[PDB]
Structure formats: C-alpha cells, structure tokens
Design an enzyme around this catalytic site. Structure first.
Site, PDB file in Angstrom:
ATOM      1  N   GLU B 121      11.236  -0.541  49.728  1.00 37.68           N
ATOM      2  CA  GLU B 121      12.689  -0.775  49.778  1.00 37.68           C
ATOM      3  C   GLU B 121      13.480   0.543  49.972  1.00 37.68           C
ATOM      4  OE1 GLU B 121      14.043  -3.671  50.451  1.00 37.68           O
ATOM      5  OE2 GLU B 121      12.387  -4.992  49.904  1.00 37.68           O
ATOM      6  N   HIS B 272      -2.236   0.859  27.020  1.00 37.78           N
ATOM      7  CA  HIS B 272      -3.545   1.479  27.097  1.00 37.78           C
ATOM      8  C   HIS B 272      -3.625   2.591  26.066  1.00 37.78           C
ATOM      9  CE1 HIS B 272      -1.096   4.309  29.029  1.00 37.78           C
ATOM     10  NE2 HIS B 272      -1.570   4.266  30.257  1.00 37.78           N
ATOM     11  N   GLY B 312      -0.524   4.257  20.319  1.00 37.95           N
ATOM     12  CA  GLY B 312      -0.617   5.721  20.442  1.00 37.95           C
ATOM     13  C   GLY B 312       0.113   6.298  21.642  1.00 37.95           C
ATOM     14  N   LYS B 313       0.784   5.444  22.412  1.00 39.74           N
ATOM     15  CA  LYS B 313       1.466   5.853  23.634  1.00 39.74           C
ATOM     16  C   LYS B 313       2.757   6.623  23.330  1.00 39.74           C
ATOM     17  CE  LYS B 313       2.253   4.898  28.244  1.00 39.74           C
ATOM     18  NZ  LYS B 313       1.676   5.652  29.390  1.00 39.74           N
TER      19      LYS B 313
END
Ligand SMILES: O=C(Nc1cccc2[nH]ccc12)c1cc2ccc(Br)cc2s1
Ligand SMILES: O=C(Nc1cccc2[nH]ccc12)c1cc2ccc(Br)cc2s1
Ligand SMILES: O=C(Nc1cccc2[nH]ccc12)c1cc2ccc(Br)cc2s1
Ligand SMILES: O=C(Nc1cccc2[nH]ccc12)c1cc2ccc(Br)cc2s1
Lengths: 344, 347, 344, 347
Positions: B121, B272, B312-313
């Site tokens: 875009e 994750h 833990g991110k």
C-alpha cells in the site's frame, strides 16, 4: 488486470488521503486540520469539526418566542444546541471543557445522567485523583477510595458533600411546604448551582446563564443517597419529572433549528422532534463515544438510527467519532467554539 | 450519615482539564491530557514513556555496552535503545503513512514490523492515490465502479494494475539474480529492493532501505503482493522467499539489543520467548500500544501489555502503556509531543 | 399520530420478534432455534446456522480436477470450505471443535495465525489451565506461567515441546539436504501432525485426511523460537512461502464453489478470488469475532468490505456474528456439521 | 535452551472443549463451556454464581433473619435473597422479553430496574409486534415507510399510535384519581397500573404487578411514554410523578434485604453508597453482568463488577462475574442452566 473491472473515474471533488508532514515542524493547528484527510476516525473528527462549526454559524445568524408555553427566561436563537454527556465525563477533566461552553453561553440545554450533577459540585469541595483501571476493589475499600474508571474519589468527598447539601435540602423542603415551590430536577440543579457559588462549577454557570439542566434519573447517584438520608431527618421533599418533561419538550418543539452534541452515550428514543412544526428533527448532530451498535444498545446506535425516529433530519449529515471523548472533545472545542469566542 | 458507614481515606495528581479561558494554546492543551483522565491520561503516560525511550536511545554507548552492542553482523550501527515500530497494514493506507515515513526518514526507529498489505500500500501510493469514502458504502456499488474499500478509504482497481505493471519487471530481475547470481531472497530483502526501486521520498520503504532499517513481514504473500508473485510465477517460475533467514535476522537484532523499546499501532505483539534470550537485557524496557482491540476474546490484538510481561517480552520493571484509541487520531499527536520535539538530535 | 407517517405494510414474509418460552421447559434444540427470532446477535446466530447449512448442502451435492496445477491429493468437491481461526482459539477448548471438523473431513483448507499450530501440538504433551484475565505479569513470571487471555500455560510446556521438536527438525534438515525436500510451512505442519501421532491433535487429523494448513507467519510464535535455537545446532533449514502461495491459490482458483468460516479475525485483502473463472468470489461466508470496524482494521471489517475486493460474491448473503467464538462456535457446530455427521 | 532462560513453574482446571464425537448432547455441551476458556469460561462461572444465588434465595429464613427481614412495609414477603434484575430497554424490544417475563411470572426475582423505553416496549408488544430487520437499514427509507429502527429490529409508527389510543384513557383515570382520590403517583406505581391494565400474560409488567414485584425507572419520561404524557398534559394538565417516593421504596428494599443478588443485562450498575447502609449485610453477595461494553472510556455501562466493590455495592468477599457478550445470546442459555432447572421450587 484481466480479472478486475476498470475503475469508474471518481467524482472531481474526491479527496485524497494524506497525513501531516512533520518535516514542516510542529504547527498544531495544521496537525489538527490534517486529521480530515488522514482517514478512519481522524476523518470523522474532521467531519465533526465541520458539523459543529455549521451549527455555530447557524446559531449566530440573527433572528415569535412562545414564552407562554416554554416558561423560559432564555430567549430562542437561530439554533438551539443540546449538549449531552454521561456522568463519567464530569468526573474527568472534560468538566472544565463543558464548564467553558456553559460559562460563555455557547449551548442552550444540558442533559446528563445519574452522577453528572453531583460530581461537578463535589469537585468544588474536594479533588478527584488519577489512578488506574486495574486497581482492586478490595484495596480501594480498605483505603476508603471509590473508583471511576482510572479516577479515584475519596469517601470523604461524599461526606463533605453531605454536610454542604443538608441545609440546602432543609430550605427546599421549607420552600415547598410554605412558599408553594413545586420542585423538579432542573429547578433543583439550578438551586445547587446557585448555592455552590463557584466559577469552576458547570452548574453555577448554567444557572447564572439560564441554561436548564435535565436529569430525570437524578436519584440514581450519590444525590439519591443524600435525598434519602435527609428524608429520615426532614421528610416530604417531592421531585416531579412531568413538569421537567414539559419544559424540555417545549424547548424541543419551538426551536427554530436544533443541534446536538452527545458525549459518552447515545440519544433517547422518542418521537417528540416530529412535533416541531417549524423544523422537525435536528439539522446537526455529533456523537463522540466508544459504544458499538451490535448489541442493539441506545449508547452504541449510529446517528442514522435516530433518523428513523425523526430525531435527526433525513437531510442532516450527522457524524459519530468512535473515540473516548476525554481525548477528542477538547480538540473539537479548540477548533470550533474556542475559535468563535469573540462572537459569544 | 455516610461518615457513619464509609471508611475514611488514608505524589497523587488531581484531575483537571484544559481551561479554554486561557485561549487556544495547543501545547498547553496537549499537556493537559495527562490530568484529564481515562484515555487522555493514558495518552499523557504514553508521551512520557516514548520520551524516556528517546532519551535512552540518545545516550552514548559506554565502552562495555559498545562491545556487546556490536555483536550483530548488520550494516546499521547499534544504539543505546533499539526501537521496534509495528503497525497493521490499514495504517499504511491511512495518512499515518506520512507519520511513519517521517520517523523512518530521520532514523528514529530501528526495525519495522507490519502485516500483509503493509508494504504494497505504501508503494502503490507512489503510483496513484487513495481516496476518502465512508464505512457504510455497499460492496455491490463499489464493485460496479471498480473500487476497493479499506475502512472509510477507497482504492481503485486501476491502482493495483499500475502496481502490477511496475512490479513485474522487478520480479523478473529478482528471479534472474536468484538463478544466476546466487541471491537468496527473503521478505525483508525483497522489501528493501522494492523501496530502492520506488525511489520516491514519500515512501516509507524507500527511506527504510536508504537508512538500513530492516522490514519484517513473513506473511508478505497474504496481500496484493501475493497476487502478483503468484501470476508472475506462471511465466517465470521458482522464486523462493525464505522466512527462516528473516527470523534469524530479526532475532539477532532482538538478542543483541542493549535495550529495547516497542511502539505498536493497530494490533498487538507476537507471543514468543525470544526476548528471554537477550543476554544483556531480557525483555523490553519501554512499550506503548495504540489500538481499539479488547482483551475479552483472548485475541493477540486485544491483549494488554501486561500479558506480554508473563512471556518475558516486556520487563516486569517496565511501565508499559496502552492507549485505547484509533491510532489515526492518537499517533500524530504522540509524535508531535515526542520525536518531533527532538528532531535535531536525530539529524 | 398527527405528526407520524402511516406505516407501509411490511412484506408478508416479515418475521416477528419472539423469544423462547421457558414455560415449555428446557428443550435445548428449540432454545437454539429461537435465537433466530430473538434479535440482535441471536438473530445473526440463526442466520449463520442457515448459511453454514447451505454451504454444507452445497458441498454434499455430487460432482475436471486440475490435479496438475493444484498438486493436491485431495479431490475437489462441489464446495471447497476454508476454515480460518486465530491462534488463541487453539489454546481454548475450541481446539476440540476444530479437531472434530478436521477429523471428519468436513472442511478442505485450514488457515491460521502465528501460534495456531504449536499450541495444538503442545497440548498433546501437557495441558493448558484456566486462570483469569486480571492475573498480573509479575506474579505469573515469578511462577513460570504464561498468560493467554484467561488461560495459563506453564513454561515447562514449551520446554517439552522443544525436546519433542528438535529431532524432527534434525530430520527435516537432513531430508532437505540429501533427499531434495523443499520445505514450506504447510509441508512442515503436515509433518508435525504426522509426528505427534495423537488423535486429539487438529494437525494429526489434517495430515491424515490431506487437509492442508497454511500459515505463512509460522515463525512469529513459539515455533520460531525453536527453529531459531535449532539453527545454532544444525543450520540450514529453509521454509519457502511462495510455493505455499501457489498451493493455496490453485485451491482458490479451481474451486467449483467456495465457502469460508472465519473465527476470531477477518479475511485477507487480495484479488485472487477474481481469477476463479468458474465461480469468482465465495458463495458463503460466516465471520464470528468481536472486532469492530471503526479503526479500519482487517479483523473488524464486515463481510461486505470483502465484496468490494471480489473475495465474497455480490449475490452471497454473508453473516457476521459479533461474539466470542468460544461461546458461539460450539453452538453453531451443534446445529450444522454435527447434524450432518452421517453424510461425512 | 528454553529451560536455560525460562523459570520452572511452581485445584487447577484443564482446558478442554466439548467433543462432538459424543453426539449432540446439549446439556453436556453447555456444561463444557466452563472449561472452554475466554467468555465461555465466564459463562460457566456465571451459571455457578446464579445457581448459588438461587440456592441462597430458597433457604428458609431463620427466626432472627425473619425478624430483620420483615422491616419493610411492603406487600411482598421477604426471602433469604433479594434479587435485582436490571436490563436496558433494547432487551425488552428483543426476544429476551419472553425470558424476563418467565422469571417475573414465577416470582424468581424481587425487583426490576430498567431504562427509558423498557416499560412501554413490553406493553406495545401486546398491541402489535416488532419485526426483524438489519442494522444497516437506512434512516431515509425507513422514514419513508413509517418504520422505527432499534438495532436490527423494526417497530412501525402505527404501534406507537395504537399505544397512544390505549394509554390516553388510562392517563385520564390517573389524573382523576390524583385530583379526587388523593393518589400520589410515582413511576413504579404507574408501571404497576399499566401492567394491570394491559391484562395480558405475555407482558412482563402484567406479571410484575400480579406478583408484587416493583419496577423502578426514574427516567420513565425519556421514551415514548414521555411523548404521550406530554401530549396528554395539553387537554388534561397536572399529572405529577414523584421520583423521591420511588427512591425511598427501592432503598427500603435494598436496606432491609437479608442478602442481595444482582443480575444486570445490557448495561452497568448505578454508582452510589446506599448498600453500605444495609445493617444486616452491606453490599451484594452475588452479581452477574452480561454486556458488551468496555471499561476504557470510564463509562458506567463498561465498568467491571470490581469497580462496584470500591463503592460498597458488591461485597469484597463476593465472586462477581461479567460475561462479555450480547445478552440476546447468553441470557436464555444462562436461564436454561439456572432458574429453569429449579422451576418447581418456585411453584
Ligand atoms: O435527547 C435527549 N433528551 C431529550 C431532548 C429533547 C426532548 C426530550 N424529552 C425527553 C427527553 C428529551 C437526551 C438526553 C441525554 C442524556 C445523556 C446523554 Br450522553 C445523551 C442524551 S440525549
Ligand atoms: O514483535 C514482533 N516481531 C518480532 C520481534 C522480535 C523478534 C521476533 N521474532 C519473530 C518475530 C519477532 C512483532 C511483529 C508485529 C507485526 C505487526 C504488529 Br501491529 C505488531 C508486531 S509486534
Ligand atoms: O483467506 C485467507 N487466505 C487465503 C485464501 C485463499 C487464497 C490465499 N492466498 C493467500 C492467502 C489466501 C485467510 C487466511 C486467514 C488466517 C487466519 C484467519 Br482468522 C482468517 C484468514 S482468511
Ligand atoms: O442498582 C440499581 N438501582 C438501585 C438499586 C438499589 C437501590 C437504589 N437506589 C437508587 C437506585 C437504586 C440499578 C438500576 C439499573 C437500571 C438499568 C440497568 Br441495565 C441496571 C441497573 S442497576
């Protein structure tokens, strides 16, 4: 390309998407102006600015008052503006924004929900503080603090309100019983505004400027607690909602033109606007709220729902901005009412 | 009476909105959001967190930090805070494309992450414009008129045709380079090449490649780019886009960051555990989300930053902020009060 | 009455609102049937049941396979059904619902987001638990627990997954390097499903029944962590997304008829459906999600947005139910697929 | 590798959905919601809380409890749990009207609270039906056809005309009774009279008055009832509706309850401190909200039950539940698993 239809050239007044370019630096007025061409709710913000400015320009056009039927000290203008807001907004700093509009006579009728009166008066006695949404009820209760979203109101604030209010309620009962006063919510709210006598108060300015306030569910909040406790000491107060219905409806049916700005919620569902023989339905409407339509709620209904009720005219171009009014309303006022201050 | 039944209460900030009796002083108005409550207060908190992130980024690297900072193999010199800027593709169709482009142009962020559509875009806007419409426009009439709807925005079919015409010769070169010059393509490398080709200073991806800001979008093929890659593969088969090398490249950035900040628009973060493997500083020290998604369905997009703390991110000691609002309204205001005030420090 | 328009008699197939009457007692089938005439999202649920049943009836009609171009072991039927879902739904008990459909060959293509593969496989190794949305990240971290909405997944679950996965990844790299295997996400997901060898697994049944799974952002979740850590021990794995694009697109363009059921999110924005020369666009679509359109997000877009892209046909009657699919999807399956079990 | 960077974990229920290989056993399917997660799990929790509320209500009053229970002046004998059922007016336009009516018919709740519209739409349905439409229907076309929209429901103008014709003679009697028989009207008394007049077993308010379940709606005049009261007041002036006496009546119920439960549909609770004045048991022991409103704007409708804990309206020791869903879907399922299973105990 072999499988896509050729595009029909768009209308020549078709507007291209383009955001503000910070390589210009920071001109906040140009930044707010660029919302119009930014898309999504930013575009709706731009549309809202245009609608509110149209409403203001209509109101400012120079002009039968029907004062016999309105029973009102406020003269009709070329556009009657209704300002509606939920009580949470009065707990927020949007109280200052609303007060400004009322102080400068920029709107004609205030409509609010339970809590929406008392939280303005209580702030004249003691402050509300910043907190967080996630604060646990157990901890807050142990510390005598009430939560309203991410705002915090100490129990003592309500105790101070009680002490301030009780001798006023005494006078109201005495005036009812011996001076023929027939109390309604709007008359009570005017009296409390007069009594608080504080230029930070929305309701002080409303009464000073003869802007009526309607809140038929007045008793659903803290004020209800107080009226109830007071009744054990001094029974007899009566608050009639029928006369308030007559007062607001006469405003609605004799308005030359109607505009509405609704914050935090939706509009009521009724047919009274159809009885305005001069101009049935509102010519201008802006809603600012985060509610969604899909559960069928009044709060989440789009303005176009109200068109089917006759509350907004078919030829109006109403706008909903899907956003927290705490963010959007001060910006909207900066670009509309606050520009036309000299005319008020 | 209430005093009889209610408990007495035991650096606290009072609620107060901007007073327009002061006139329209726009900086003072923006500053008053912090004390206005609800999302206005979250906006103020976000401004503070982004400014903290910026001040960290501008700190000199000490000698030790410089050593462990230098452990990527990448072009882009490491700084005291690696900022990830994430956004959904709809925001690139919006005017926020200009805001993002400004940040990328001036090297104010370090890694871009986006969704399907979020690359093409931007490129297509250099060939033909997007227009304002309305959310309620009916699919039947738009189809008759050859127009695609994105929210209240409109993109003619002809825009995608011009894009195809522009892109095909580039895909031809990419396949030739893969088969004769040993090039191993990945989405990030393709995105860099497309930015270089478009060669237009209004393009986010032009600036990203020029400034060595990598772009990651492993679901690149879920949009219009996919359509064109697919048709191209008829007459010119065998293009490979490897997502494993891009994973390696982004994780290396994440793992060797001295400090990490995130600004996420329109959606949520990935779930994750890779941030737990950053040896110097595990988890992000700063994070701001700006979106209208709600948590109650368990969706990624609607998760509060505090969910990511459990993965833990984001660090336990960070003070992340979510502003529950459409980023088309909020992000330019945020930039005005943060990055745009410090532009000289980035020049 | 003097001010309201006379009502134009409604169509003779106009349906009156009426809820279930519990004076009948509790017949759950009749209760679910009554949603259709209850209104709001209950009505949309009824519409969804009708659309999914139409899709199933179309699929069950008896039948050129284009097997050269599809490269697929799964024969075409009279309706190709795409089932899409976000990864959070696989963490939920909706995993069991999806597994049932896949096990019985009731859908033809699975599409999911990052996390949506691994959480199904991990549940074969260790359980997910119930928690609460409000649980604080600090406390969860101190106890080695990951939150997904109101669900809880111990860190150990991911450690078990790593141990299970590593020797499979070793085989994949060896097969790539010495047996010419060209890995893609869909081929990897089929292999993991074969390897897990557990009839509770969605992906075990998908591979057994030759239902391909597409997830080009496979590397955004835990599986990415694993692939990355594995690459330090055994470098070289390549996952190509272009061949997966070709496989799914050939399904899309050679389908005789297309239906979609999309849970938790919206559809992708592209034009490939226009290249289906037999039947361009889907004839049937149901979305079940809580996302709202007003920010312009793909997730919150109504089905009618996709009509402008050609992804859903103009003459289709698509339905969105605005609800958490954890509540609605099992009910929808009870009234549709689970009734037609004998035909599958 | 993850074991190296992640901490090990230290009556917990496993996630598991209904298995349709068992066939369509509807009770087992509903029971499996509790372990399905997200709002399905909140549904299960709500079922449990409502069943606890019901079991409490059905407990005999001990001798002491009976004494302090008997301290209202009302018709309706007090029970071991006073249940407040609250709902927004849109739900009365919906088929949930039948569900509410069932509960009221069988004396399963004690007090009804609703919003503007929530009385008249029930009465109007005894005169003429509401029809299914769509949310997207345009106001212009509906206006041309004399049709009012409520969400995806449609109410012809003619319904409100029939209602006016029905109501005017009742308002005539009410004014005459006020002026010649000393009647002091309040909204709750008006609602009782309208239920008695409609005299139709499909009406919620017919059953409420028949079973002495008071209805409170101080903003009664914000709907179609207001329109008609207003026009009526032209030829027959002076009707008074006192909201203070209704406040007294509801607070007396709240203050002398032995125990309180709330079920709130479509919206949130009022913010006040009156529950702190119940001498026997301050605050509700049970509460379930079913709505789709979000808290982030600070709205009443979107507040979590735990907000009301800070006001004293819900007890600290209660385990309130909010199901984030449209009550048109959820409430009949909830009733099926709770009140409808115990119908004999209420007969
Ligand atoms: O339109 C309203 N009230 C009326 C206008 C005119 C004649 C009337 N008669 C009876 C009621 C009424 C509204 C009242 C409120 C209250 C809070 C919020 Br937020 C929005 C609104 S909109
Ligand atoms: O955090 C992300 N990606 C990663 C960071 C660091 C190491 C990584 N490894 C594998 C993925 C990844 C995110 C990606 C995106 C994309 C769109 C939007 Br809106 C938000 C986000 S947040
Ligand atoms: O429609 C999709 N994918 C495609 C169909 C057909 C040909 C295609 N080519 C490239 C992509 C693609 C969708 C994918 C997903 C993923 C998760 C969720 Br929730 C909804 C959807 S819808
Ligand atoms: O709690 C309420 N009312 C009161 C209970 C007890 C003593 C009271 N005194 C003054 C008011 C009141 C509520 C009223 C309503 C109305 C609609 C919907 Br949806 C939810 C609620 S919750």
């Amino acid at each position: 390309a072999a499988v896509l239809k050729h595009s029909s050239t768009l209308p020549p007044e078709s507007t291209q998407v383009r955001g503000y370019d910070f390589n210009r630096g920071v001109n906040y007025r140009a930044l707010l102006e660029a919302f119009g061409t930014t898309g999504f709710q930013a575009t709706n913000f731009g549309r809202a600015v245009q609608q509110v400015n149209a409403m203001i320009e209509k109101k400012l056009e120079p002009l039968d008052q029907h004062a016999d039927l309105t029973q009102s000290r406020r003269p009709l203008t070329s556009c009657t503006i209704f300002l509606g807001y939920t009580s949470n907004l009065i707990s927020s700093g949007i109280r200052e924004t609303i007060r400004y509009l009322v102080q400068h006579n920029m709107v004609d009728v205030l409509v609010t929900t339970a809590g929406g009166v008392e939280e303005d008066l209580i702030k004249c006695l003691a402050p509300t503080y910043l907190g967080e949404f996630s604060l646990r009820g157990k901890e807050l209760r142990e510390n005598g603090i009430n939560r309203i979203g991410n705002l915090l109101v100490p129990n003592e604030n309500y105790c101070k309100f009680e002490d301030w209010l009780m001798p006023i309620l005494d006078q109201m009962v005495m005036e009812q019983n011996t001076e023929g006063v027939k109390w309604t919510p709007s008359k009570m709210i005017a009296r409390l505004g007069k009594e608080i006598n504080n230029p930070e108060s929305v309701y002080y300015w409303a009464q000073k400027n003869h802007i009526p306030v309607f809140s038929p569910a007045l008793t659903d909040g803290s004020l209800g607690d107080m009226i109830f406790f007071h009744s054990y000491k001094n029974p007899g107060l009566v608050l009639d909602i029928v006369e308030d219905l007559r007062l607001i409806n006469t405003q609605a049916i004799f308005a030359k033109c109607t505009g509405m700005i609704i914050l935090g919620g939706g509009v009521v569902k009724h047919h009274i606007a159809n009885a305005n023989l001069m101009r049935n339905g509102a010519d201008y409407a802006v809603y600012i709220n985060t509610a969604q339509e899909f559960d069928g709620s009044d709060s989440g209904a789009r303005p176009d729902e109200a068109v089917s009720w006759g509350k907004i005219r078919v030829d109006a171009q109403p706008v909903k901005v899907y956003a927290d009014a705490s963010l959007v309303f001060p910006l909207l006022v900066a670009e509309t009412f606050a520009q036309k201050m000299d005319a008020f």
